């Protein structure tokens, strides 16, 4: 589509948090489109990147790829401006062939979005418990 | 968590299908939980695998990883059992350090779940158009 | 300029059909910009590419290239996937020097368009009659 501001709602454990992501242009040298938060300092921004790669003479597959980067920052003892303490990442790769219909791709997308809200995965991701 | 059956409703583009999934145990070599479709034959079922990896001397941070694959069955002539024509794949990997809190990890999980229903990722994943 | 969705109207032998093209990024290795039609099974899409020489300081020859390919679908009996019987190609190259003006290039483009609307060339292409 066209990059406009994406606002996401019902985020968190309570599901009462939102997040707005403003467009930050497409990078011509790899085709990666960027969304970021609304800060002044660029190291403190939660950002999302998204790309999709056509088949070539090497891969022969359509490859969709989404990345999420959330820094957490705090100011230390004897320090004035906050520095970035931690990074929480996420990296999704979709892979499809030339003869796949769109309903298959929509099934895989909705299947992932429905798995991410099921008690197996929200226990494996939030509390860090392997499925046993 | 416990490996139970998982019912994924409001799935697909119209949002009216279900995908029911039966647990297929864990793997003592890898540590990976598996789940397959209800019904089946082997090699013609929809698969979901999930692993959680702790810190070690090699990697310092936790790593959760979800990996879903699903085939397309085509009935050729002269044979009674179907073949697979296409696979569709998706694999998410989450990376969290040891001082991260439950709220941050839930924020990443629910951000990805909310983001895959946004028109940028609709039009990226099931129509294969990039952003402009 | 920047790529957008190009809707072309009044196409065909009768002059009624449309063609909606969505952008599909720039190849970084040669600068070719793609447009393709929103059709299922991405091997069967109307595809258009456009390639302009990048403005240097000491370039002697500016060169524009447009390519069209339209495939045909054939659901062969005894298979589940449509294949490509035919392609239809079109390859347009414009060549200009560094002292050419805007009106010369515009005259060449509108001349080629007015020839493609002329009965000499909707008889050489549509009916395959050589001019004699």
């Amino acid at each position, epitope marked *: *589509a*066209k990059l*406009e*501001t*994406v*606002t*996401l*709602g*019902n985020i968190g454990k309570d599901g*009462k*948090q*939102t*997040l*707005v992501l*403003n467009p930050r242009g497409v990078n011509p040298t790899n085709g990666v489109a960027s969304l970021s938060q609304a800060g002044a300092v660029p190291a403190l921004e939660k950002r999302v990147t998204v790309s999709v790669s056509q088949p070539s003479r090497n891969r022969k597959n359509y490859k969709v790829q989404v990345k999420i980067q959330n820094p957490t920052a705090c100011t230390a003892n004897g320090s004035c401006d906050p520095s970035v303490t931690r990074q929480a990442y996420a990296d999704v790769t979709f892979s499809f062939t030339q003869y796949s219909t769109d309903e298959e791709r*929509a099934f895989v997308r909705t299947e992932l979005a429905a798995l991410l809200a099921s008690p197996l995965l929200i226990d494996a991701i939030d509390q860090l418990n392997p499925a046993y | 968590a416990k490996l139970e059956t998982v019912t994924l409703g*409001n799935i*697909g*583009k*119209d*949002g*009216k299908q279900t995908l029911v999934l039966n647990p297929r145990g864990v793997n003592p070599t890898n540590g990976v939980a598996s789940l397959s479709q209800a019904g089946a034959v082997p090699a013609l079922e929809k698969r979901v695998t999930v692993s959680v990896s702790q810190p070690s001397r090699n990697r310092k941070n936790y790593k959760v990883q979800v990996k879903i694959q699903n085939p397309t069955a085509c009935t050729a002539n002269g044979s009674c059992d179907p073949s697979v024509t296409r696979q569709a794949y998706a694999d998410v990997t989450f990376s969290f350090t040891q001082y991260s809190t439950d709220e941050e990890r839930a924020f990443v999980r629910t951000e990805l779940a*909310a983001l895959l*229903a*946004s*028109p*940028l990722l*609709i*039009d990226a994943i099931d*129509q294969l*158009n990039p952003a402009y | 300029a920047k790529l957008e*969705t190009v*809707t072309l109207g009044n196409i065909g032998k009768d002059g009624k059909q449309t063609l909606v093209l*969505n952008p599909r990024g720039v190849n970084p290795t040669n600068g070719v910009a793609s447009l393709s039609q*929103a059709g299922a099974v991405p091997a069967l899409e109307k595809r258009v590419t456009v390639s302009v020489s990048q403005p240097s300081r000491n370039r002697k020859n500016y060169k524009v290239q447009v390519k069209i390919q339209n495939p045909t679908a054939c659901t062969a009996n005894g298979s589940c996937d449509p294949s490509v019987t035919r392609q239809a190609y079109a390859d347009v190259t414009f060549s200009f020097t560094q002292y050419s003006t805007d009106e010369e290039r515009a005259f060449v483009r509108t001349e080629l368009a007015a020839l493609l609307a002329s009965p000499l060339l909707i008889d050489a292409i549509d009916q395959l009659n050589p001019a004699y």
Partner: antibody, heavy 114, light 108 residues
Framework: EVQLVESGGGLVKSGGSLKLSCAASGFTFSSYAMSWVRQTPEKRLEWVATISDGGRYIYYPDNVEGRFTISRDNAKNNLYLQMSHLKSEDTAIYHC?????????????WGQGT | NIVLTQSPASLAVSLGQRATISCRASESVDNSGNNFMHWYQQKPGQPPKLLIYLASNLESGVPARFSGSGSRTDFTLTIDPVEADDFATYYCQQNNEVPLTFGAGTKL
């Protein structure tokens, strides 16, 4: 160019029914949430209905919910509003609107008609 | 419902002046640091055009004379040069809660 034109229109009696339509060219229709927003002759705007990308999650206000019905056709790129029971407050313009890439809509593109 | 009481519905403002429009919501508008208030402009023979979204952000084709500010209940739309074109009704809209409620309108 996001284009939205409407049909149906109408001059009805009370308690009738009508079906407004919307044509929606210029963009990938099946990705975006669509909406109806009417404008009274005393020049007040009112939200009428919203639908999701595939037609699964539909929202109505309390003044509307029992007697209006919206739907999509993502192959014909059409948006539909089924008006019924028409209790004489329903004398408005009934614009189409494309929703923002969001959670709850703020209308960015509008269609003039009816 | 959240009721937006817009302002007194008229403004007698000259050409080169600077006109403010208020909008006061009933309840709070925030859900995080994000203000969920939007301003629309309607010229009398054509549908409304979205001027500013999220109470502070200019849409991609507005001439940056317009600006928006506000916090949690109180929002203001201000025009500086206030040219001939800017004679239209103005609307404030929220999307925090599920019934989407509009403002009454301010002609000028």
């Amino acid at each position: 160019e996001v284009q939205l034109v409407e049909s149906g229109g109408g001059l009805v009696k009370s308690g009738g029914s009508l079906k407004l339509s919307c044509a929606a060219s210029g963009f990938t229709f099946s990705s975006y949430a669509m909406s109806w927003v009417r404008q009274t002759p005393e020049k007040r705007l009112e939200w009428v209905a919203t639908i999701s990308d595939g037609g699964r999650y539909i929202y109505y206000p309390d003044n509307v919910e029992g007697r209006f019905t919206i739907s999509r056709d993502n192959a014909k790129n059409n948006l539909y509003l089924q008006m019924s029971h028409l209790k004489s407050e329903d004398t408005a313009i009934y614009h189409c609107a494309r929703d923002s890439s969001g959670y709850l809509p703020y209308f960015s593109y509008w269609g003039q008609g009816t | 419902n959240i009721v937006l009481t817009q302002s007194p519905a008229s403004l007698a403002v000259s050409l080169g002046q600077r006109a403010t429009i208020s909008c006061r919501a009933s309840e709070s508008v925030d859900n995080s640091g994000n203000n969920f208030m939007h301003w629309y402009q309607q010229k009398p023979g054509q549908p409304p055009k979205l001027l500013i979204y999220l109470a502070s952000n200019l849409e991609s084709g507005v001439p940056a004379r317009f600006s928006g500010s506000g916090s949690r209940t109180d929002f203001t739309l201000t025009i500086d040069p206030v040219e001939a074109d800017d004679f239209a009704t103005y609307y404030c809209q929220q999307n925090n809660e599920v019934p989407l409620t509009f403002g009454a309108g301010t002609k000028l």
